[PDB]
Structures are given as C-alpha cells and as structure tokens.
Amino acid sequence: ASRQRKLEALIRDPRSPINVESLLDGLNSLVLDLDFPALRKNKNIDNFLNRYEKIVKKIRGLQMKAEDYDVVKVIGRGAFGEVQLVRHKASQKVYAMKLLSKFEMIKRSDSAFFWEERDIMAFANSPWVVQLFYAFQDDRYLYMVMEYMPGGDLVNLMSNYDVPEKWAKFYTAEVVLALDAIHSMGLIHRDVKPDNMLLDKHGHLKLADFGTCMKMDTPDYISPEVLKSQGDGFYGRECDWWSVGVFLYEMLVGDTPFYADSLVGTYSKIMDHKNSLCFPEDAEISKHAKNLICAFLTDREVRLGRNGVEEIRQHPFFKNDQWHWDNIRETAAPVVPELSSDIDSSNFDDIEDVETFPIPKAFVGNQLPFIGFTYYR
Amino acid sequence: ASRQRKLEALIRDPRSPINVESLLDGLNSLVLDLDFPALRKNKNIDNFLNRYEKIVKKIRGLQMKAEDYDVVKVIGRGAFGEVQLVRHKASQKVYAMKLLSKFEMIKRSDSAFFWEERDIMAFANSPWVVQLFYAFQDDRYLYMVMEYMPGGDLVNLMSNYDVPEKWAKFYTAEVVLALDAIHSMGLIHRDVKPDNMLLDKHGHLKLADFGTCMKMDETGMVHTAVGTPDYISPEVLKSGFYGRECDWWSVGVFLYEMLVGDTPFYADSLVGTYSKIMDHKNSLCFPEDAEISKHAKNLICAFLTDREVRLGRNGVEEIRQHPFFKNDQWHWDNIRETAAPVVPELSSDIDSSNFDDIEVETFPIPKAFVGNQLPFIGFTYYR
Numbered sequence: 001a002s003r004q005r006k007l008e009a010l011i012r013d014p015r016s017p018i019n020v021e022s023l024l025d026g027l028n029s030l031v032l033d034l035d036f037p038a039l040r041k042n043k044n045i046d047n048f049l050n051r052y053e054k055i056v057k058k059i060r061g062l063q064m065k066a067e068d069y070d071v072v073k074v075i076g077r078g079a080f081g082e083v084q085l086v087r088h089k090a091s092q093k094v095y096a097m098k099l100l101s102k103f104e105m106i107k108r109s110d111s112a113f114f115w116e117e118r119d120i121m122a123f124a125n126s127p128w129v130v131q132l133f134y135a136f137q138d139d140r141y142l143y144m145v146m147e148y149m150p151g152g153d154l155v156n157l158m159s160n161y162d163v164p165e166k167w168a169k170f171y172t173a174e175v176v177l178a179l180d181a182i183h184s185m186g187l188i189h190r191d192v193k194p195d196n197m198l199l200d201k202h203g204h205l206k207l208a209d210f211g212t213c214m215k216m217d218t219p220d221y222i223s224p225e226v227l228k229s230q231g232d233g234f235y236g237r238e239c240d241w242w243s244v245g246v247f248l249y250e251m252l253v254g255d256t257p258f259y260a261d262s263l264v265g266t267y268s269k270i271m272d273h274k275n276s277l278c279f280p281e282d283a284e285i286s287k288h289a290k291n292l293i294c295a296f297l298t299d300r301e302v303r304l305g306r307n308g309v310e311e312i313r314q315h316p317f318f319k320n321d322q323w324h325w326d327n328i329r330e331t332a333a334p335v336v337p338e339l340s341s342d343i344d345s346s347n348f349d350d351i352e353d354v355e356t357f358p359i360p361k362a363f364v365g366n367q368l369p370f371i372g373f374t375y376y377r
Numbered sequence: 378a379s380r381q382r383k384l385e386a387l388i389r390d391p392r393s394p395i396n397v398e399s400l401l402d403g404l405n406s407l408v409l410d411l412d413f414p415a416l417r418k419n420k421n422i423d424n425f426l427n428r429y430e431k432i433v434k435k436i437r438g439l440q441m442k443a444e445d446y447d448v449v450k451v452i453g454r455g456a457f458g459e460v461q462l463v464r465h466k467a468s469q470k471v472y473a474m475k476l477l478s479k480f481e482m483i484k485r486s487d488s489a490f491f492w493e494e495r496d497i498m499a500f501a502n503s504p505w506v507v508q509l510f511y512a513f514q515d516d517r518y519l520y521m522v523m524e525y526m527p528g529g530d531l532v533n534l535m536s537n538y539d540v541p542e543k544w545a546k547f548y549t550a551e552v553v554l555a556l557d558a559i560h561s562m563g564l565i566h567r568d569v570k571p572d573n574m575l576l577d578k579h580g581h582l583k584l585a586d587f588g589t590c591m592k593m594d595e596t597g598m599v600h601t602a603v604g605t606p607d608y609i610s611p612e613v614l615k616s617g618f619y620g621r622e623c624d625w626w627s628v629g630v631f632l633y634e635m636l637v638g639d640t641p642f643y644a645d646s647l648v649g650t651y652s653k654i655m656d657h658k659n660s661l662c663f664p665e666d667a668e669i670s671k672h673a674k675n676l677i678c679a680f681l682t683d684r685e686v687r688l689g690r691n692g693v694e695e696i697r698q699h700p701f702f703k704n705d706q707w708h709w710d711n712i713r714e715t716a717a718p719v720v721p722e723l724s725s726d727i728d729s730s731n732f733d734d735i736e737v738e739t740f741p742i743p744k745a746f747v748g749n750q751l752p753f754i755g756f757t758y759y760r
C-alpha cells in the first residue's frame with residue numbers, strides 16, 4: 001500500500017544506496033565476481049549466469065562506458081590513478097575524467113575515500129566545487145566525469161607569475177569562501193594546498209580532489225595539531241584555516257613559510273612555528289597581509305576561523321576597491337586564461353608514465369566495495 | 378541518450394529479468410548468501426554487508442512477507458511444499474497461497490519449473506487460469522498468492538456425484554477451452570488430470586498447478602518423462618519429442634473417467650497400466666453397464682488414438698465441431714457465463730469444505746560462498 005510507495009521513493013532518490021543505478025551495479029558486480037570457470041562448477045552459479053548472460057550483455061552496451069569517450073591527453077597522475085582530458089564521442093563535449101584503479105585501492109587498503117569525493121562533487125551544487133556529471137565503472141576502474149577546468153591549478157599560476165598582493169587578496173578570498181562552503185556541507189578538507197585549487201575558463205577558483213575530506217561529528221601545508229594527532233588526536237575546521245595562512249604566505253613571499261630540504265625538517269619547523277615563522281626582509285608585503293598570515297599561523301586554540309568565517313571576512317587585508325564577498329566570483333578575475341580551443345591543456349604540465357585482480361579460485365568479491373558508485377546526473 | 382531511455386524501458390517492463398523487483402531480489406539474495414560469520418573474514422564481504430545492513434532491514438520490512446498473511450488452513454500438500462488458505466491481515470482479503478521449499482527444490486535438482494508456473498498465472502490474463510496476485514520469497518520459501526477456488530477440484534466432484542453426460546459435456550468443454558488458452562500461450566501442459574482442475578465460487582473451471590508446463594519450440598514440439606500414469610499418453614510413455622496433442626489424450630481419459638467412473642486403462646500394478654495404455658487399440662473397452670452415448674464414445678475414441686491421427690492435431694476447431702458437444706444450454710463463446718451444474722453452497726469466505734483434510738530441513742551454514750538464493754532471483758512479482 002503506502003509501503004510500495006515508500007519503497008519506490010527510496011529507489012527514486014539519487015542519494016539512495018538502492019537507486020536503479022546502484023541496483024544495476026549490484027547485478028553487474030555479482031556477474032563479474034561469479035563469472036570464472038572454477039566458480040561455474042557450482043550449478044547455482046552456472047545456471048544464474050546463463051539466465052543473466054544475455055541481459056547483462058545488453059546492459060553493458062547501453063550503459064555509459066570508457067569507450068563512449070575519446071582520450072585527448074593525460075593531464076594528471078595521482079596515487080591511485082590518473083586524470084584524462086576527454087571528449088564524449090556523441091555530444092562532442094569536453095570533460096575531465098578521473099580514473100581510480102580498483103586493484104590498487106583494494107591492494108593498498110584504501111577503498112572508501114571516493115564516496116565523499118563523489119558525493120561532494122555530485123551534490124555540493126556550488127560554484128566553488130567542481131561539478132560531477134557522471135560516475136561509472138568497469139571491472140578495472142572507477143571513472144568520474146567532471147567539468148574541465150582549463151585555467152589549471154594555483155601551483156601553475158604561482159610558478160608563472162610574481163603574484164602581487166591585490167591578486168593574492170582575490171585568490172585568498174575565493175579560497176576562504178570555497179572552504180566555507182565545504183565546511184557548511186559538514187566537511188573538513190584536511191589537505192588544502194594549491195594543487196587542489198583550480199581555475200575555470202574565466203580564471204575563477206573551484207576546489208577539486210576531495211580525497212582527504214572527512215565528515216565532521218605533503219607536509220608544507222599541514223597544521224601542527226594534525227601533525228601531533230597522527231601519533232590518537234582529534235581536530236576541527238580550524239586546521240584548514242592554517243593551510244590558508246600557508247597559502248597566502250606562499251603567494252606573497254614565493255617560498256613556503258616552513259620550507260626545508262627534508263620533510264622531517266619541515267615538520268620540525270611547523271611544530272616550532274612560534275619561533276620558525278620569519279618574513280624575509282626583502283619580501284614586499286603589507287602589515288595587514290603579515291597580520292592575517294600570523295592570525296592563521298597560530299596554535300589551534302586561538303586561531304582565526306575558530307569562531308567561524310565572519311572574523312576572516314572582516315579582516316582589513318581584504319578591504320578593496322574591486323569586489324565584495326557577495327559578488328567576488330561574478331567580478332573580473334586577475335588572470336583570465338587565453339585558450340586556443342576546447343581541448344587546450346597548456347596550463348597543465350606534461351606527464352610521463354598495470355596489474356589486474358588474479359583469477360580467483362573461489363568467490364572473493366573484489367567488485368563489492370564499488371557497488372553504488374555509478375551516478376548519472 | 379536514447380540508450381538511457383532504452384535501458385529505462387527494460388527496467389520498467391514487468392516481464393524483464395532486470396525490473397526493479399528482480400534487481401532487489403538480486404540484492405537481498407546477495408546479502409542472504411554472504412551474511413555468515415565465516416564469509417565475513419573476507420573484508421570485501423564484511424564491509425559490503427555493513428554498508429548495506431540498514432537499508433536491507435528497511436526493505437525487508439517494507440516488502441511483502443508471509444507474516445503479512447494469517448494461515449487459516451492447509452488445503453493442499455505437494456511434492457515441494459503446500460497450499461494454504463490465507464487471509465491478508467490489513468486488507469482482510471482471502472487467498473490461496475502456494476509455498477515451495479527452496480532446500481527441497483535445490484536438493485532434488487528441480488529448481489526451474491516455478492518460472493513458467495508463475496508467468497502463466499501472472500500473465501495468462503484468462504478466466505480459465507487461476508490469477509496470481511503476488512509472488513514473493515523468504516530465505517526458506519517461494520510463495521505464490523493466487524485467487525482462492527472454493528469449489529474444490531474435479532477429483533472431489535467425481536467422488537461426490539455420479540456425473541451425468543450433460544455435466545461431463547460442460548466440464549469437458551471448459552477443459553477444452555482452458556487447454557486451448559494454454560496452447561495459445563505457447564505451452565504444453567503435460568499433466569492434464571482432474572487434480573489440476575479447480576472450481577470457482579460459481580462452479581466454473583480454472584486450471585491450476587502449472588508445474589509440468591513446457592514452452593513449445595517454434596515447431597510446437599517439446600524435449601525425462603513426467604506424470605501419474607493413468608492420464609499419460611503412449612507417446613510420452615515411449616519418449617523422444619511430443620506436442621500439444623498429448624494433452625488432448627488426457628482429455629479423452631478425463632471424459633472417460635467422468636462418464637464411466639473408472640480410468641480407461643486401470644490396472645492394479647503400474648506396469649499393467651502402461652502395458653494397457655501402449656495397447657490402447659485393443660485395451661480400451663466401454664463397460665456394458667456404463668451410461669454413455671455413441672457421440673461420447675466417439676469423442677473419447679477420437680482422443681485415445683496414436684499421436685499421428687489424434688483429434689486436436691489440426692487444432693481445436695475439429696474438437697469444438699464434434700457433435701458430442703451439441704446442446705440446448707450453452708455455446709462455446711458463452712459457456713462460462715452460463716449456469717454451472719454444481720454451484721458450491723459456501724457458508725463463508727474461508728469455507729474449505731470442498732477440500733479434503735491433510736495429514737523440514739534448511740540449508741547448512743556454508744563454509745564458503747555457495748549461492749543457494751541465486752536460482753530464485755527474479756521470482757518476486759507485485760501485481
């Protein structure tokens with residue numbers, strides 16, 4: 001009665017683990033996990049597969065797949081895969097496509113980070129967060145089709161420009177609002193660095209790579225609390241604000257505040273931040289700028305953005321003739337990328353470069369961890 | 378594009394193996410098959426189950442289940458389970474509910490017959506076929522909820538009445554139309570007997586128990602020998618392939634049993650019966666005390682021949698046109714809308730007086746994945 005309506009409503013909902021796409025993943029995964037000669041000696045398994053052989057072929061053909069896209073260039077490599085500039089053959093539309101290796105994720109006991117990353121991108125519904133259009137999978141890989149950010153990352157920008165203060169003010173403010181959005185979604189980022197900051201066709205910020213994001217209840221940018229925790233300890237949204245401090249320093253000064261040749265040296269410097277933070281005497285930087293940086297680069301307890309974002313927004317470093325907080329993203333960016341075509345990847349550095357699951361002797365469920373991943377916007 | 382529309386259309390279709398109910402069976406089955414302590418030592422399995430623990434509880438609660446019905450009486454027992462007169466607690470509506478044991482079906486290498494049985498009752502869309510309203514499953518059982526047939530079976534009727542010819546004419550004609558419907562759906566019944574013939578509240582026939590039904594080829598034949606023997610045809614005995622004509626043999630037998638009161642090829646032993654059936658040219662003899670017309674005898678004989686020359690080889694028209702069926706009471710286009718010979722006098726909606734009174738082991742906890750629920754993925758059906 002109402003029960004059939006209730007159940008139908010669960011299945012309709014795109015956030016549901018039992019939506020149509022998830023239920024299909026369930027089927028595809030089961031077939032992938034069971035379709036091996038050794039396992040088909042079991043008559044239950046063999047007859048099941050025979051019954052569902054035809055229909056699962058049909059589905060694989062109809063459903064979205066890697067073959068539906070043409071790979072133009074690899075624009076990123078990461079711990080568990082790569083990012084590809086692609087074009088969808090039919091629509092001719094250009095996207096960024098993130099690939100994640102199932103084998104590697106399983107092998108290296110790390111097979112749950114993608115869920116929040118997927119959800120953030122699918123559902124944030126925010127101009128500070130990169131949009132996911134499609135998520136799908138093969139037997140080897142998870143794929144995430146996102147909107148292509150042709151302006152490249154902030155690491156790129158800082159390496160190709162001496163950044164004046166007015167620019168840094170803009171970018172910092174955009175990072176501030178972006179992080180606030182993430183925080184509103186109940187998330188701590190945990191890895192705010194310019195590698196994870198991307199510029200759109202109009203030179204405006206969007207955040208990408210949400211692989212460290214956690215739902216609330218490289219060391220250069222890590223905060224002292226997070227450092228001391230990992231030997232347990234707990235921490236909050238203020239740890240991201242530390243990283244903004246670092247970011248602003250890097251932009252204005254051009255080196256990282258706690259740079260050392262080794263990683264251990266850097267940790268040691270960060271821990272000793274009260275003494276180690278020194279603005280070089282040749283650095284062309286305002287008092288307000290220095291003030292803000294220092295406000296961020298304190299112990300967790302007294303750090304700017306402990307009492308939320310307003311105190312950050314109200315800081316006088318951010319005073320300017322060009323933009324307000326309510327309209328910054330709708331204003332002219334410092335650097336609008338000059339792009340020659342829809343596949344222009346000039347703001348992305350070139351990249352130079354496999355093993356699958358072994359054929360199992362019994363049921364092992366290597367596809368089980370990824371049931372639910374598929375998403376069609 | 379159109380692909381997402383094509384795929385959606387597959388899932389919408391109630392005949393599809395990937396409809397929503399089937400996809401859910403898929404999930405439930407996977408959880409039932411994996412949720413055992415030994416298997417959860419595999420981290421893929423354990424974490425999957427943890428993720429899907431809550432939502433699968435929710436689903437089990439929402440979905441139809443045996444607990445939703447109150448069992449009033451067991452009205453039938455069969456090879457792989459039982460038939461229960463039930464009442465659905467909320468609606469208060471009465472149904473017949475057929476149960477089939479998963480364990481037994483698996484154990485006794487017979488785990489596909491129910492598919493056609495389900496489909497026949499779900500989709501026949503015919504007054505000669507018992508309507509299935511719901512099909513569902515537990516970890517132990519398949520359930521089929523059907524319309525309750527309070528008039529009982531023809532075995533019952535024959536035992537409680539000397540059946541005159543006019544009656545037999547009626548019931549035979551109803552069986553003829555019923556079998557024609559089954560045949561139109563592309564099916565050979567293979568087990569036409571009065572046990573499988575049931576009377577509704579108004580005393581009219583519907584067929585039930587489609588457990589022997591087979592889908593014909595594109596050439597009408599079917600491919601190891603089923604049935605209680607009295608009603609089995611010589612071709613099916615000697616088999617080997619056979620067609621729709623083997624059901625018509627059984628109608629011959631049925632008509633004989635109604636009119637005469639014993640089976641045409643009765644013997645004390647089974648071997649004697651087979652021997653008689655095989656020798657039907659000589660063995661078929663109408664007893665001198667039997668109340669039966671020439672036309673009746675003619676029809677029976679027309680059915681009780683070798684497959685090659687049997688009535689209903691050239692379809693049903695020749696059967697319908699046989700003069701035995703001529704009468705003052707009904708035509709073929711309206712028979713079922715005319716007054717039945719015996720309207721059951723029933724005291725209540727749970728009256729089972731036309732049903733005779735009626736006088737367990739589960740799957741072991743498996744050490745590795747074995748997929749005992751896999752054979753039943755797709756069974757669930759909500760009309």
Ligand SMILES: COc1cccc([C@@H](C)NC(=O)N2CCN(c3ccncc3F)CC2)c1
Pocket residue numbers: 075076077078079080081082083096098099100130146147148149150198208209211
């Ligand atoms: C742990 O596994 C992986 C696998 C691949 C990549 C990564 C990290 C290094 N970077 C990343 O995920 N991204 C998101 C997509 N980014 C865009 C590039 C253009 N357009 C839009 C993007 F979102 C680029 C950075 C980690």
Ligand SMILES: COc1cccc([C@@H](C)NC(=O)N2CCN(c3ccncc3F)CC2)c1
Pocket residue numbers: 452453454455456457458459460473475476477507523524525526527575585586587588
């Ligand atoms: C092989 O396993 C089984 C298990 C149980 C029953 C059977 C067979 C022997 N009988 C059967 O299927 N039926 C259909 C339901 N029938 C109705 C009874 C009242 N009302 C409506 C019915 F359809 C009564 C006979 C076989």
